């Protein structure tokens, strides 16, 4: 049971700081090099930093030089990332990864064990529950527009979970206001509208907001 | 700094097929090339290191070849679990760089999108903002184009879109496109149209409404 567990992520404002931790167990921590790798929402993998097994050499991707500091406490089996002067483009899921090394100097070789990751959101937006708006119909389609909330996530079900088939809850988009928005649509046969009632159930835990909206043909 | 170019950025395939992906390096990295697999919401998984060595425990179908600047990742006969995104990474020199990613998706026959359009609710209208949603539903392949026109005035930049992943049953995609306008700007116009082009569609479908 070899494990890497990241923690420390959360919502932080631009120009502020965050310390990520990574607790290693099940192997000889002080014998491996460690890496921090990040993935912006919906984008690819980006290397961030590596620290040598003995903590003596450190390297950083260019965009974080002078802002981020990678450290390790081999006694505590812990890897650390000190993130100063945060920018919006630092918003990502951060992973730690162990690298055995190759060569005389034990430089990086490959990353065989990863953590599950920790989510960093850099935004000056404050916690805010969504406004739920109907997408009225006229195979028929209807749905809910879950607009202007922060932070992620928000959950959407239909008819208190009764209705599942024919439902597409889309990945949220970040608007220029810094708030999030998503749509959840359901497709049903045209005949159903006259009698059947359609409720979408919006839950946003961060702002402690629960909303039930009925979608009606206008 | 070494650039890792991955191709193709996407590809379709079916169970049993033979798939190959390529990572090209802007300069020689000897054979310090690694391949990773990632599924949505999950951490990467190492498949291959040192260009051709296979990580302990990984199925035998996965193989890699290459040296210097050109490298290949091969799945012999595809499997249902294999549909995922694959990244290459050079480990020759810092800064270590990943490729852009290659998504391996499920091949299926062409399907056309059922297009719907939704005017803004009056509930929303009181607030001072207006969102017009256009729903492309259960189409294939992924590529599609959505075009917003407001009294024939082409809309560019004031819309966003998001797509689902392939469906568990029919391997289809669905797309929402949201046009955002001020309340006053919404009142000032009568025709709102969503024009959709797609391979399964013989001609660009246009769904519209009036205020």
């Amino acid at each position: 049971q070899v494990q890497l567990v990241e923690s420390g992520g959360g919502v932080v404002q631009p120009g502020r700081s965050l310390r990520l931790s990574c607790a290693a167990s099940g192997f000889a921590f002080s014998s491996y090099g460690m890496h921090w790798v990040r993935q912006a929402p919906g984008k690819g993998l980006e290397w961030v930093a590596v620290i040598w097994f003995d903590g003596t050499k450190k390297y950083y991707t260019d965009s974080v030089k002078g802002r981020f500091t990678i450290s390790r406490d081999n006694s505590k089996n812990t890897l650390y990332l000190q993130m100063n002067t945060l920018r919006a483009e630092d918003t990502a899921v951060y992973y730690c990864a162990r690298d055995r090394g190759i060569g005389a100097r034990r430089g990086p070789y490959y990353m065989d064990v990863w953590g599950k990751g920790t989510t960093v959101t850099v935004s000056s937006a404050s916690t805010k529950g969504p406004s739920v708006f109907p997408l009225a119909p006229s195979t028929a389609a209807l749905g809910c527009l879950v607009k202007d909330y922060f932070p992620e996530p928000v959950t959407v079900s239909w008819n208190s979970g009764a209705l599942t088939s024919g439902v597409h809850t889309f990945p949220a988009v970040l608007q220029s206001s810094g708030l999030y928005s998503l749509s959840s649509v359901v497709t049903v046969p045209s005949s159903s509208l006259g009698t059947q009632t359609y409720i979408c159930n919006v839950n946003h835990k961060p702002s402690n907001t629960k909303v039930d909206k009925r979608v009606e043909p206008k | 700094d070494i650039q890792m170019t991955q191709s193709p950025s996407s590809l379709s395939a079916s169970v049993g097929d033979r798939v190959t992906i390529t990572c090209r390096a802007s300069q020689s990295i000897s054979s310090y090339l690694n391949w990773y697999q990632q599924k949505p919401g999950k951490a990467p998984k190492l498949l291959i290191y040192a260009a051709s060595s296979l990580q302990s425990g990984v199925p035998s179908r996965f193989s890699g070849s290459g040296s210097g600047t050109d490298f290949t990742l091969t799945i012999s006969s595809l499997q249902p679990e294999d549909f995922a995104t694959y990244y290459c990474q050079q480990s020759y020199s810092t800064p270590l760089t990943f490729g852009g990613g290659t998504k391996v998706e499920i091949k299926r026959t062409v399907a056309a999108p059922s297009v719907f359009i939704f005017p803004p609710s009056d509930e929303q209208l009181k607030s001072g903002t207006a969102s017009v949603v256009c729903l492309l539903n259960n189409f294939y392949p992924r590529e599609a184009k959505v075009q917003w026109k407001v009294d024939n005035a082409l809309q560019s930049g004031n819309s966003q879109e998001s797509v689902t992943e392939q469906d568990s049953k029919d391997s289809t995609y669905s797309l929402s496109s949201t046009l955002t306008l001020s309340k006053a700007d919404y009142e000032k116009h009568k025709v709102y149209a969503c024009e959709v082009t797609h391979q399964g569609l013989s001609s660009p479908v246009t769904k519209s409404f009036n205020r």
Binding site: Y59, I102, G103, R105, G107 | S30, Y92, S93, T94, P95
Partner: peptide, 6 residues
């Protein structure tokens, strides 16, 4: 000063 193998 970046690190390079070999």
């Amino acid at each position: 000063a970046e690190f390079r193998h070999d």
